[PDB]
Amino acid sequence: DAELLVTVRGGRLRGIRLKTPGGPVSAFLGIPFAEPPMGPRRFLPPEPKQPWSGVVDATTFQSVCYQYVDTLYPGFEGTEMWNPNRELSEDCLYLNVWTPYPRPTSPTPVLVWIYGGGFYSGASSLDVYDGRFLVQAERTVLVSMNYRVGAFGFLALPGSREAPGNVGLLDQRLALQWVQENVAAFGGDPTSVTLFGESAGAASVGMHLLSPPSRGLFHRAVLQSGAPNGPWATVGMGEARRRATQLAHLVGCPNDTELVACLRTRPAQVLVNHEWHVLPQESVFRFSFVPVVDGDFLSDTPEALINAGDFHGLQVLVGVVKDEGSYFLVYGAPGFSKDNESLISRAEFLAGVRVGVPQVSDLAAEAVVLHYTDWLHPEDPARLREALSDVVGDHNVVCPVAQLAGRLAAQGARVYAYVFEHRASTLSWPLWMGVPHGYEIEFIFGIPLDPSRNYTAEEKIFAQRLMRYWANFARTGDPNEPPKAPQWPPYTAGAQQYVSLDLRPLEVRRGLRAQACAFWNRFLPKLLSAT
Amino acid sequence: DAELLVTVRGGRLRGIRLKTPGGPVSAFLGIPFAEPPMGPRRFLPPEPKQPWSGVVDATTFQSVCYQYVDTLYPGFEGTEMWNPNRELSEDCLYLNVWTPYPRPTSPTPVLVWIYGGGFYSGASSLDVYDGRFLVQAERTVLVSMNYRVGAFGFLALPGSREAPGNVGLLDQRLALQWVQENVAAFGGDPTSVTLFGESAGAASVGMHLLSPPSRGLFHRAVLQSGAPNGPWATVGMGEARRRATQLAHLVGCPNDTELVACLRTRPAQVLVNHEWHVLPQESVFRFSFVPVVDGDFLSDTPEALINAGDFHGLQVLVGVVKDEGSYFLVYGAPGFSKDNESLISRAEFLAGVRVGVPQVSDLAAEAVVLHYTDWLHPEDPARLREALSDVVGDHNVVCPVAQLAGRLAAQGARVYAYVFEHRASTLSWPLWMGVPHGYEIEFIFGIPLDPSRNYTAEEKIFAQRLMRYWANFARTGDPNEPPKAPQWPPYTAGAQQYVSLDLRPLEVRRGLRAQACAFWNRFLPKLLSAT
Amino acid sequence: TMCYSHTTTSRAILTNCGENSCYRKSRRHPPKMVLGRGCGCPPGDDNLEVKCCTSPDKCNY
Amino acid sequence: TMCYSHTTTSRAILTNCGENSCYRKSRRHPPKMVLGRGCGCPPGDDNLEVKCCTSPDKCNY
Ligand SMILES: *[C@@H]1O[C@H](CO[C@@H]2O[C@@H](C)[C@@H](O)[C@@H](O)[C@@H]2O)[C@@H](O[C@@H]2O[C@H](CO)[C@@H](O)[C@H](O)[C@H]2NC(C)=O)[C@H](O)[C@H]1NC(C)=O
Ligand SMILES: *[C@@H]1O[C@H](CO[C@@H]2O[C@@H](C)[C@@H](O)[C@@H](O)[C@@H]2O)[C@@H](O[C@@H]2O[C@H](CO)[C@@H](O)[C@H](O)[C@H]2NC(C)=O)[C@H](O)[C@H]1NC(C)=O
Ligand SMILES: *[C@H]1O[C@H](CO)[C@@H](O)[C@H](O)[C@H]1NC(C)=O
Ligand SMILES: *[C@H]1O[C@H](CO)[C@@H](O)[C@H](O)[C@H]1NC(C)=O
């Protein structure tokens, strides 16, 4: 219990050791890294947490940042495992550190985790993000932080000082800066920080990659089922304030200063009450408040940056899951649900193309319908279901990722690609959704090693196999064994090689949904532009 | 030699018996069926051949209708086997009859052949169309006729009486009428006439199917590598006279009557000299003068008819060859030739999409490029070559045929589909072109049985196998054995079943280039319309 | 009747509505995020769809 | 020189052009149908492309 006491620039901390089927780990949960964004501070970039006297209790996780609670399926697991599992509060900027036991003698590489949740939800205290096993097995340091979401994290009035926007990304960054001056106290090496995140967390990672000021805060990146260039990852200044003003209106407000001042006077829950209203209707996989292209945090759209940027001296690990789209369809796509097998009819399918592909012309839709239709089985409910699943998945995740990957690899970086295609045996989601969005996380963190859970012996080995890849990447910038084991090749714009990640061994494959993504990234743009 | 004398409504005829590895056959070649379309008659519908005194010599083929001679590759076989092999003349409306020996005792089914040649070339006297073997093996009656082509057959001044257009189709019909009153003289059964043709000949067949007046002239139809609804099969009244007037201009002419009168004063070769000029530039698989949608012969576009028509009480046999497009590319597609392997570059390919897909918007082309590109091998010369081949082939033959077939089958007819995918061992065309356009003909007529030729023992069996199919269709309206041999199913709009025709046995397959044809027949139309 | 109850920021729990009906407030157009359930049958709007029930018991799910 | 010779309606045959050059008249844009070959180097036009030669012998092919 002598290792559970550590001092950081702010003050003294008292942690707790966590048990593991392999050994204890020292964890420090709830370290305050910013001054709480209460009242006057709401909507403003974060200010560094001021020094404190005495010892801070870092034994239990801290509050989850105020957010909407997804209540689609009351009592369902696949839906509740992502909801806040601690009291909500605007006072939520805290972070956590998981370091080996005993504390490493030499500086050990660090892994910083940014959670997903469409920028409207999420928390570092979710069970599926427990870093004890990953830290215990690969003996690395792990840090995860909470960052503002929803209006509190991203409501923006582009240009204003009261509500500049992207403050959520600023929280993430302040936490990365906290890691630079303090991780060494826990034996972490600030000259070897690797960021990894999933969904919106991956998008965030990508944005820190595209934001100069964040560049001196890490050295490697992992983007899981998400990219900064997705059609949902950002919104323009225009739309940004259109939404911000709508929220104010719905809430009785009221001049930017005036609008915000009023906004600061409303209860957190009142704002969350009207969060979804401001969404330019009919779509799935779209969120109200997200990062804004304002010229500050991002000098240009992520797409613009990803093409003009020089990525030399950078290693990136990117990937998606077998069925990225399935998940979202039950939130609006006609005929879709978790309670049956969603064998939609050609009618529903065609209507679903419009929900799964928001703000697009009628001719654009027909273009989608053409490509995703099996003209030998135009009416087959089974295929139409997997088709609308791919539609949403390719459009929102696979193709954005595939493009970033090729542009990165092609412009000086080392990229490794993967497709997590193994369904967890504990999956509560219906069998038809396959390996849905965000379901590779539980394995990357090695949750199968936890006894209280019921995973298979092979899945525990698998989890271990995966963690090594991640840990290897963190240490060397390369996944495979630093062997005589199947080799994972770098993803090149040329061969476009990636590997499947299931119980079977690494299998190398070319093309990452190449034919489809040509539609999304190359043709569709021209089609829309011409009409 | 008593069977070589036959009398028809016109008069007495003297034929010749032709030798065959299986037995002699009585043939009557060059029977005049119309009054020669000379001078004043040029451009006018044909008039019935007036009765003659004495006996007409029907021992040798008659003149080939005046036409352009394809001289692309001087001395080449794949190109010359289609050129006129008899003196050219405007006096060319003659037909031929091949009847068994001895002459059948009971009325035997008839097969009428209409040759191809893009409506600008062709002749019933080409070696590859010798009906002796087909008649000898399946013991059926075979008739083939010459019909005007080029300006002489189709130059049109829509509405006029001097140059109404489609007179070529009228020649074909007059010959079919000649078959109704005379085929019985040769033992043929006018209540069982089956039309079969290739390329433009298939298109013609289709038009007789869509033209009321021709309906009482046959009972079955076979469309080989062609359909009346192809983008080259017809032209509108507008374009029709735009071209007709251009020809007159280039030729010094000059009021419709005035234009035509002058046109009648020009030498046949002078008109042929300027035939290709009138073609609205840059394209491949497009011909100057073709059938016109004027409301007379065709009351509406073939497409319109094919959808509104009732096809009950009709059996149709349709099909294409493995590589319908290859052939035409050497006539303009950059980087294409018979002298090398046309391994085009991505640059040439993209330019070729425009030649292979005439009068289409830039966005339409990109739409083509998207679908016919292997995005895992965007630059591969081998694949780009087979891609531009499919592009032209699908657009001009496979998809028009696939649609006609489905509309026919779906609207009351019995349809049987096939894909001739066996390369003749005597093919003079380069190996890269595969099984090119019009190369299934030599087998349907059983040319491999001819000793002077060098086909393989298996190919002679094959030829026989094919002729039976054709002959069976003619007799019963069904290809397969009227057995315990693989069965050829009817092509349905549903299953879309067809069989491969190679040395191996009949293999049934679904989908006739379904995915691609969805682009051409369903989407592309909407795309063009919207821009 | 035994129905569900919650807000935009609370997890759904069971409650006894009795003779009153129950409701399910969601976003009208996709994403049709559930915004709240409870007792009664309140008015909705362009963005607020409200579905009511009684018989089923725990029907406002 | 030994070159090809023909019209729009005759099959190509060999001919001795001598010191004159030879030509290949074709349609300028696709379809680039060959319209005639012979001796000399005559003018073309928007629709008529003419290619001349000498050395090769049978080059106007
Ligand atoms: C599969 O489920 C969907 C959605 O769940 C159903 O609808 C709920 C209201 C409830 O009745 C559940 O028990 C069902 O499982 C079904 O789609 C709905 O179908 C109803 C018709 O009864 C229709 O009124 C709704 O609008 C539909 N909802 C939407 C927008 O999809 C679907 O019919 C089910 N398919 C199967 C396999 O039966
Ligand atoms: C394959 O052949 C094509 C066409 O034939 C060639 O060009 C003739 C003029 C003559 O030179 C033949 O012997 C050749 O085989 C080639 O395409 C032509 O290439 C030349 C460059 O030398 C160019 O100037 C022409 O414009 C091209 N013609 C067109 C429009 O396609 C092609 O280069 C050959 N490819 C191979 C395998 O070498
Ligand atoms: C094992 O625990 C899981 C919860 O993680 C539970 O779902 C499963 O039913 C348990 N197995 C049993 C019944 O012992
Ligand atoms: C057989 O005849 C063909 C012509 O049909 C010819 O091409 C081939 O070379 C001949 N075989 C020989 C050389 O005996």
PDB file of C-alpha atoms in Angstrom, chain A residues 282-286 325 327-333 352 355-358 392 396, chain C residues 30-31:
ATOM      1  CA  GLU A 282     -34.628  11.684 -40.626  1.00  0.00           C
ATOM      2  CA  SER A 283     -31.383   9.777 -40.356  1.00  0.00           C
ATOM      3  CA  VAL A 284     -29.564   7.218 -38.285  1.00  0.00           C
ATOM      4  CA  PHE A 285     -25.960   7.558 -37.076  1.00  0.00           C
ATOM      5  CA  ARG A 286     -26.156  11.386 -36.740  1.00  0.00           C
ATOM      6  CA  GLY A 325     -24.034  -0.715 -39.523  1.00  0.00           C
ATOM      7  CA  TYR A 327     -26.623  -1.585 -34.587  1.00  0.00           C
ATOM      8  CA  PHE A 328     -28.021   1.806 -35.680  1.00  0.00           C
ATOM      9  CA  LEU A 329     -30.849   0.507 -37.888  1.00  0.00           C
ATOM     10  CA  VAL A 330     -33.095  -0.336 -34.895  1.00  0.00           C
ATOM     11  CA  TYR A 331     -33.300   3.385 -34.161  1.00  0.00           C
ATOM     12  CA  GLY A 332     -35.540   4.258 -37.095  1.00  0.00           C
ATOM     13  CA  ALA A 333     -35.031   2.030 -40.149  1.00  0.00           C
ATOM     14  CA  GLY A 352     -34.394   2.720 -45.290  1.00  0.00           C
ATOM     15  CA  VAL A 355     -32.795   7.108 -43.393  1.00  0.00           C
ATOM     16  CA  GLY A 356     -29.383   5.458 -43.623  1.00  0.00           C
ATOM     17  CA  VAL A 357     -28.180   8.066 -46.111  1.00  0.00           C
ATOM     18  CA  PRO A 358     -29.387  11.490 -44.844  1.00  0.00           C
ATOM     19  CA  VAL A 392     -24.953   2.544 -43.134  1.00  0.00           C
ATOM     20  CA  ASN A 396     -20.358   6.036 -41.734  1.00  0.00           C
TER      21      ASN A 396
ATOM     22  CA  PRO C  30     -35.034   9.011 -36.884  1.00  0.00           C
ATOM     23  CA  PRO C  31     -33.012   8.743 -34.836  1.00  0.00           C
TER      24      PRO C  31
END
